[PDB]
Design a binder for this molecule. Structure first.
Ligand SMILES: Cc1cc(Nc2nc(NCCc3cccnc3)ncc2Br)[nH]n1
Ligand SMILES: Cc1cc(Nc2nc(NCCc3cccnc3)ncc2Br)[nH]n1
Lengths: 278, 271
């Protein structure tokens, strides 16, 4: 092997490896000079192939290009020399947005309307940035958004190497859901991924926020999903969700990609709506 | 029954006093609109169930028992009532009330304009219809908005309450069955209560389709998982908890129609 790179390189002895987070491990980074920062550390299994290294490296290099933003999982450093590759990224202690929301359901301290609307604003900001840095996510969902101790939304997995011409549509998320339910049609049937298809996925993310971790199309298998999509079926409006916000998800789910709003626009509308939401 | 049906003068209408009309709908049976006369020279618009020309003995006998079930059950404002029959010297006609505005699903869907009260009132009426039926030992087994007809004057009338394959569809009726009815083939008044839950969900989604895209094998999965549909929008948390009450995994914990009528009475007056 790996080229050295002093902009990012951290000494192996400056990193105290702790509990597995699920390999991604929690760690402590001394310096970054006599203070420690909790960080998460991406690494490879023993199992691993040369393609897996290739992928971790790509991911890290992408993170290098895209630069920093409050609302993405930032790269903090890396251990690349005389040992296993460690990619050091920001740690987000309260898990993925899906879990964080589900846990705050009524029977923990519940979330206000303002909080839910504020969640969506932060993800729409993270997305605007990624978009402006020419990056297309392809799997935007609540699960790939994380929450820090301070309740800050952080888009994760945005640098990921994934050969789209090899997606297993029948494969389930670790929690039992099917990724295809976040995919814009044209991505799904035609494999055309744009900022526009991400916006479709933001639509479903909004739905998740406002049903507090709801599952899109429950018990709807793949073949039936395609039918719902081809028929132009749109999900029902969540309760405790406003028409204006329901219009937004609908607008994100416009059939014609060019007519969907952009993230720049969404960030403006969310800014306006957070301010007026109780 | 091959050559002649049993006479019952109480209900017999002479055929000259009935003028058949536009078909209303076809089934496994047939229903036609008709103009009946003297139920004494007044024309009443009525609905006329009858066999199709490919019926068997068994099909006729079922139509008969359906008619006889209606006689045993008796009249109520919120059901489809027996008005008469032609049983002699020709095909069997079972004359029942005509509901000019079709089934509740369609009715709701055509009006997406009913107020919050109109909707609750609708639910009240259905539940009365069911309390009555229930008090007469009658278990519907397919209670759903599609089997509630609506009249010119906007009254709800339970249809198919007198009737005699999970994949037959273009929705799946299994999506209305109680778990015990589905899995244990137990059919009680409380298994209709569960269906009433899904009907309430239809009402307040204004003809919504429950579990769209979910096939039979996945639906079994969900019920087992204790999965319940989400509170519709434009639905109070108490109306939605009525639905959840109806959807209790234990039948005896469900409310009764008697209970539902009393609850829905209260809520109608307060909407
Ligand atoms: C990268 C990161 C993870 C966390 N916090 C947590 N992470 C996990 N595991 C998520 C697995 C993963 C792998 C790659 C990208 N995203 C997530 N579990 C619990 C927590 Br808390 N902060 N930062
Ligand atoms: C018995 C009856 C039917 C009507 N009016 C209408 N009926 C249909 N199809 C009736 C078949 C049916 C429906 C529900 C339950 N059982 C049988 N279509 C339109 C109308 Br209007 N009035 N009285």
């Amino acid at each position: 092997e790996l080229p050295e790179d002093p902009r990012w390189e951290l000494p192996r002895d400056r990193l105290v490896l702790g509990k597995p987070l699920g390999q991604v491990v929690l760690a402590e980074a001394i310096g970054l000079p006599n203070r420690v920062t909790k960080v998460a550390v991406k690494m490879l299994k023993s199992d691993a192939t040369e393609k897996d290294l290739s992928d971790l490296i790509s991911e890290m290099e992408m993170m290098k290009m895209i630069g920093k933003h409050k609302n993405i999982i930032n790269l903090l450093g890396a251990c690349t020399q005389d040992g296993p590759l460690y990619v050091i990224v920001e740690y987000a202690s309260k898990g993925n947005l899906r879990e964080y929301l589900q846990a705050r359901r009524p029977p923990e301290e519940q979330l206000s309307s303002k909080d839910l609307v504020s969640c969506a604003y932060q993800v729409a900001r993270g997305m605007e940035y990624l978009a402006s840095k020419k990056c297309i996510h392809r799997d935007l969902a609540a699960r790939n958004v994380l929450v820090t101790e301070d309740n800050v939304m952080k888009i994760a997995d945005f640098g990921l190497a994934r050969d789209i011409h090899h997606i297993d549509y029948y494969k389930k998320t670790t929690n039992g859901r099917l990724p295809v339910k976040w995919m814009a049609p044209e991505a799904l049937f035609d494999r055309i991924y744009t900022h526009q298809s991400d916006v479709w996925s933001f639509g479903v993310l909004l739905w998740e926020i406002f049903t507090l971790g709801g599952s899109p199309y429950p018990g709807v298998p793949v073949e039936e999903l395609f039918k719902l999509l081809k028929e132009g079926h749109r999900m029902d409006k969540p309760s405790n969700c406003t028409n204006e916000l329901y219009m937004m998800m609908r607008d994100c789910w416009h059939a014609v990609p060019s007519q969907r709003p952009t993230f720049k626009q969404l960030v403006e509308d969310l800014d306006r709506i957070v301010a007026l939401t109780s």
